[PDB]
Amino acid sequence: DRQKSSFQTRFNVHREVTPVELPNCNLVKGIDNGSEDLEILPNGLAFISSGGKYPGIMSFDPDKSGKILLMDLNEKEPAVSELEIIGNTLDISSFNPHGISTFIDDDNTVYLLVVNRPGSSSTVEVFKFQEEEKSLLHLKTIRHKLLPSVNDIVAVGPEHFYATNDHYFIDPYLKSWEMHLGLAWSFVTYYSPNDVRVVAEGFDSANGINISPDGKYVYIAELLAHKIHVYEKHANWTLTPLRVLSFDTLVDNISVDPVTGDLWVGCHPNGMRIFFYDAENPPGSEVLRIQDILSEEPKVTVVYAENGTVLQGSSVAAVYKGKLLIGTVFHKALYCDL
Ligand SMILES: [Ca+2]
Ligand SMILES: [Ca+2]
Ligand SMILES: [Cl-]
Ligand SMILES: [Cl-]
Ligand SMILES: [Cl-]
């Protein structure tokens, strides 16, 4: 079949991980049920989305709740704490976080945007971060017909963001059929209070999304195409294609380093192991650094790679002052000397 061929191309089924080691990597105590996305502020506080659940993805603790965790990366051996969500505008029993993003106001108010999928429906929750009290003040729940199945967002103001949708459909049965057939109907939305538009479409599962430090480019990961799309971001928020980068791995969430502009990318080398879990054959981990992404030949380095004997299912990676923090879809988190 032509379909069985493109299926085992999309899920990269023949792929094995040549190890790339780091000598001082330590599992973060307290993270056992996922750390699928994370973001580090310029002051070294890192937010971690944890406990999220997906229909069909593995879970070691099904009654576990979704949590936003805090980590101070300026500490020597940093520990995670669960952030308290306060407010009355949000149903916490169904809180099921996925991608996250931050925005820092001119007053230095910190806003956290959190992709929420309570049930089959999909929202974006915006919180105010209260560092002293170590809490998240809920502000708003954002819902839209152009946000059917949000995977990750990148904030550009307190309720302004680009959002990936990893499926066109909302219903989980059609969702898996969509994903199995490879329709590639997932798309990217710009959301703002006064204006909500599709800015790109035709993606075979758009996952991570991020922005360059100067605002001029947007990066979008296409999981099952193994591609990172680079877009020019215009003053009217529309996007025009620029580069497409290709890899031998499923690219998941994208972090951008503020100083260099470098991309750090959490990857699933073999899509079968991450989608059809099997304890005797667990998914591995791979972290990519991407430099000089606008130039003729961009520099791609594998900074860390492993078959899962330590860390299973890396989905996000970010660096801070010599340290590398790696998160997983549903497993642990690895803190590493670079
Ligand atoms: Ca994110
Ligand atoms: Ca994901
Ligand atoms: Cl793997
Ligand atoms: Cl460049
Ligand atoms: Cl290995």
Side-chain angles (χ1 to χ4, degrees), residues 291-295:
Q291 290 169 278
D292 301 326
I293 195 181
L294 301 173
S295 60

Side-chain angles (χ1 to χ4, degrees), residues 39 100-103 152-157 160-164 188 190 207-221 228-235 237-239 253-264 293:
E39 191 141 325
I100 70 180
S101 195
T102 55
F103 176 82
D152 200 6
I153 78 287
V154 51
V156 288
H160 317 66
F161 55 89
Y162 298 90
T164 56
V188 180
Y190 170 78
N207 266 57
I209 187 169
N210 220 311
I211 193 172
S212 65
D214 62 8
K216 286 173 73 233
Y217 307 86
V218 165
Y219 313 109
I220 300 168
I228 293 190
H229 301 253
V230 184
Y231 284 86
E232 191 187 329
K233 162 163 168 280
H234 300 279
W237 310 99
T238 64
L239 308 183
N253 297 323
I254 299 177
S255 304
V256 175
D257 174 71
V259 189
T260 54
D262 291 356
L263 272 72
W264 294 77
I293 195 181

Side-chain angles (χ1 to χ4, degrees), residues 7 42 51 56 59 119 127 211 223:
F7 176 94
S59 177
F127 308 79
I211 193 172
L223 190 76

Side-chain angles (χ1 to χ4, degrees), residues 275-279 281-295 298 300:
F275 279 97
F276 311 98
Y277 181 73
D278 175 353
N281 185 33
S285 287
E286 189 170 55
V287 177
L288 298 189
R289 174 195 191 179
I290 300 174
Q291 290 169 278
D292 301 326
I293 195 181
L294 301 173
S295 60
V300 186

Side-chain angles (χ1 to χ4, degrees), residues 312-323:
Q312 292 167 21
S314 60
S315 57
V316 58
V319 297
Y320 176 75
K321 289 187 185 307
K323 310 274 168 141

